[PDB]
TrEMBL record:
This is Polymerase basic protein 2. Plays an essential role in transcription initiation and cap-stealing mechanism, in which cellular capped pre-mRNAs are used to generate primers for viral transcription. Recognizes and binds the 7-methylguanosine-containing cap of the target pre-RNA which is subsequently cleaved after 10-13 nucleotides by the viral protein PA. Plays a role in the initiation of the viral genome replication and modulates the activity of the ribonucleoprotein (RNP) complex. Belongs to the influenza viruses PB2 family. It comes from the Viruses. Residues 2-164 form the Influenza RNA polymerase PB2 CAP binding domain. It is found in: Host mitochondrion; Virion; Host nucleus. Influenza RNA polymerase is composed of three subunits: PB1, PB2 and PA.
Length: 164
């Protein structure tokens, strides 16, 4: 049985691929240990939000491609953040600043993936600045988006393209 799920305000659906779960202990940009359930395998997902949608292709702790469309700069940026965290990429982990000890209304500690999400939703500047950039080749006729969230016809955040 396949099922959708919600992460970061987006409805995710795996559209192809597979993965196995493992636990990996990572050390953040502030030397905090997080034990994350890492998915190993190549997978493709849709992401559906109120004001943005995306297709995310990822492998093991690796964002391969994010094609994102949205109504405005902020909503595009929200989807990018969520996909970056969901990738479980090392560079996202290393972009963390300070400790992560977020707890919910119920005072329940958030799990590592949600700790990361809460942190980067608050401020993504470090994430975006450290993620990496690349020239676009225009083969999809799409547009780039830069770490400052401005569009670019030349370059984009690594693996990210913005579509109409
Ligand atoms: C980073 N990450 C976090 N999760 C868990 C999402 C929550 C799933 C749930 O609540 O059920 C993931 N699930 C998958 N594939 C598995 C997709 C399976 C579809 C399903 O059975 O729900 N891949 C990932 O990279 C991944």
């Amino acid at each position: 049985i396949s099922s959708s799920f919600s992460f970061g305000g987006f409805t995710f659906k795996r559209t192809s691929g597979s993965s196995v779960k493992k636990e990996e202990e990572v050390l953040t940009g502030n030397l905090q240990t997080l034990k994350i359930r890492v998915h190993e395998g190549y997978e493709e997902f849709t992401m559906v939000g109120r004001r943005a949608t995306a297709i995310l292709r990822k492998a093991t702790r690796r964002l391969i491609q994010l094609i994102v469309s949205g109504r405005d700069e902020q909503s595009i940026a929200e989807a990018i953040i969520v996909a970056m965290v969901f990738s479980q990429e090392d560079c996202m982990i290393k972009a963390v600043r300070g400790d992560l000890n977020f707890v919910n209304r119920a005072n329940q500690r958030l799990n590592p993936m949600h700790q990361l999400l809460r942190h980067f939703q608050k401020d993504a500047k470090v994430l975006f600045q450290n993620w990496g950039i690349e020239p676009i080749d225009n083969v999809m006729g799409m547009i780039g988006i830069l770490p400052d969230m401005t569009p670019s016809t030349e370059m984009s955040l690594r693996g990210v393209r913005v579509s109409k």
